[PDB]
Amino acid sequence: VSQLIDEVDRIASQAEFNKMNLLQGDFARGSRATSMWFHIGPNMHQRERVFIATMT
Amino acid sequence: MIINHNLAAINSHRVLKFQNEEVSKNMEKLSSGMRINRAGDDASGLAVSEKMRTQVN
């Protein structure tokens, strides 16, 4: 059982898409480090936010 | 009427060359069947693609 939880912890710590960790919740509700933005418009002001919580 | 040069011919040649280089780049990139063939096409795309391919390996 402890092996399974530590393996889940390993997954959370080793999650990576663009050399950026995701499962540690760097973009949660109270994210202070930095913020995600999806520029999905031809103009600079068209910016969309997406949030991910801590999975530890 | 001046016949020293054909300005219309020169303009047509310039347009022709400026678009033949473009069609050459096209030919190359679809013959490779792949988008970013060299630096200067999309540097960020090339970098992220090579990095994530190294991650794949």
CSV table of C-alpha atoms in Angstrom, one decimal:
chain,number,residue,atom,x,y,z
A,1,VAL,CA,0.0,0.0,0.0
A,2,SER,CA,2.8,2.4,1.0
A,3,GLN,CA,4.5,1.4,-2.2
A,4,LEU,CA,1.4,2.4,-4.2
A,5,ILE,CA,1.1,5.8,-2.5
A,6,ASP,CA,4.8,6.6,-3.0
A,7,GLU,CA,4.5,5.6,-6.7
A,8,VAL,CA,1.6,8.0,-7.0
A,9,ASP,CA,3.9,10.6,-5.4
A,10,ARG,CA,6.5,9.8,-8.0
A,11,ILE,CA,3.9,10.2,-10.8
A,12,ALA,CA,2.9,13.6,-9.3
A,13,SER,CA,6.5,14.8,-9.0
A,14,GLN,CA,7.5,13.5,-12.5
A,15,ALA,CA,4.6,14.9,-14.5
A,16,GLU,CA,5.9,17.0,-17.3
A,17,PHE,CA,4.5,18.3,-20.6
A,18,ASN,CA,6.8,21.1,-21.8
A,19,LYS,CA,9.5,20.8,-19.1
A,20,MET,CA,6.9,22.1,-16.7
A,21,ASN,CA,5.4,20.2,-13.8
A,22,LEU,CA,1.6,20.1,-13.7
A,23,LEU,CA,0.4,17.8,-10.9
A,24,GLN,CA,2.0,19.8,-8.2
A,25,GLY,CA,-0.6,22.5,-8.7
A,26,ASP,CA,1.6,25.5,-9.8
A,27,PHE,CA,-1.7,26.9,-11.3
A,28,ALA,CA,-4.3,26.2,-8.6
A,29,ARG,CA,-6.9,28.5,-7.1
A,30,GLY,CA,-4.3,30.2,-4.9
A,31,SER,CA,-1.3,29.8,-7.3
A,32,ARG,CA,1.2,32.5,-6.4
A,33,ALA,CA,4.3,31.4,-8.4
A,34,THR,CA,2.9,32.0,-11.9
A,35,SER,CA,-0.2,31.8,-14.0
A,36,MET,CA,-1.3,29.9,-17.2
A,37,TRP,CA,-2.6,31.8,-20.2
A,38,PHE,CA,-3.9,30.5,-23.5
A,39,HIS,CA,-3.5,33.2,-26.2
A,40,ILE,CA,-6.4,32.1,-28.4
A,41,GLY,CA,-7.0,35.4,-30.2
A,42,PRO,CA,-5.4,37.5,-33.0
A,43,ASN,CA,-4.9,40.4,-30.5
A,44,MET,CA,-2.7,40.5,-27.4
A,45,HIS,CA,-5.7,41.2,-25.1
A,46,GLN,CA,-7.4,38.0,-26.1
A,47,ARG,CA,-6.0,35.8,-23.3
A,48,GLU,CA,-7.6,32.8,-21.6
A,49,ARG,CA,-6.8,31.3,-18.3
A,50,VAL,CA,-6.7,27.6,-17.3
A,51,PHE,CA,-6.1,26.2,-13.8
A,52,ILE,CA,-4.8,22.9,-12.4
A,53,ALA,CA,-4.9,21.9,-8.8
A,54,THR,CA,-2.3,20.2,-6.6
A,55,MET,CA,-2.3,16.4,-7.1
A,56,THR,CA,0.1,15.6,-4.2
B,1,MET,CA,9.3,55.2,-76.9
B,2,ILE,CA,12.4,53.9,-75.1
B,3,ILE,CA,13.8,50.4,-75.8
B,4,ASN,CA,16.9,50.3,-73.7
B,5,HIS,CA,15.2,48.1,-71.1
B,6,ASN,CA,11.8,46.3,-70.7
B,7,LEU,CA,10.7,47.5,-67.3
B,8,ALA,CA,7.6,45.3,-67.4
B,9,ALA,CA,9.8,42.3,-68.2
B,10,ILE,CA,12.1,43.2,-65.3
B,11,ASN,CA,9.1,43.4,-62.9
B,12,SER,CA,7.7,40.1,-64.2
B,13,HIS,CA,11.1,38.5,-63.7
B,14,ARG,CA,11.4,39.9,-60.2
B,15,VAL,CA,7.9,38.6,-59.2
B,16,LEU,CA,8.6,35.3,-60.9
B,17,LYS,CA,11.8,34.7,-58.9
B,18,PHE,CA,10.3,35.9,-55.6
B,19,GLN,CA,7.5,33.4,-56.1
B,20,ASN,CA,9.7,30.6,-57.5
B,21,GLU,CA,11.8,30.6,-54.3
B,22,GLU,CA,8.5,30.3,-52.3
B,23,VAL,CA,7.3,27.4,-54.4
B,24,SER,CA,10.7,25.8,-54.0
B,25,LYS,CA,10.4,26.0,-50.3
B,26,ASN,CA,6.9,24.5,-50.6
B,27,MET,CA,8.2,21.6,-52.8
B,28,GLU,CA,10.9,20.9,-50.3
B,29,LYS,CA,8.7,21.0,-47.2
B,30,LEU,CA,5.9,18.8,-48.5
B,31,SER,CA,8.4,16.4,-50.2
B,32,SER,CA,9.9,16.0,-46.7
B,33,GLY,CA,6.3,15.5,-45.6
B,34,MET,CA,7.3,17.6,-42.6
B,35,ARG,CA,6.8,21.3,-41.6
B,36,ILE,CA,10.0,22.7,-40.0
B,37,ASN,CA,12.9,21.8,-42.3
B,38,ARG,CA,15.5,24.3,-41.1
B,39,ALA,CA,16.1,27.1,-38.7
B,40,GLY,CA,14.2,30.3,-39.5
B,41,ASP,CA,10.9,28.6,-40.3
B,42,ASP,CA,9.6,28.3,-36.8
B,43,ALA,CA,12.4,28.3,-34.2
B,44,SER,CA,10.2,27.8,-31.2
B,45,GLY,CA,8.3,25.0,-32.8
B,46,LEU,CA,11.6,23.3,-33.9
B,47,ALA,CA,13.0,23.6,-30.4
B,48,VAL,CA,10.0,22.3,-28.6
B,49,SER,CA,9.6,19.4,-31.1
B,50,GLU,CA,13.2,18.3,-30.7
B,51,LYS,CA,13.1,18.6,-26.9
B,52,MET,CA,9.9,16.5,-26.7
B,53,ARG,CA,11.3,14.0,-29.1
B,54,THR,CA,14.4,13.6,-26.9
B,55,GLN,CA,11.8,13.1,-24.1
B,56,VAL,CA,10.2,10.4,-26.2
B,57,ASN,CA,13.5,8.6,-26.6
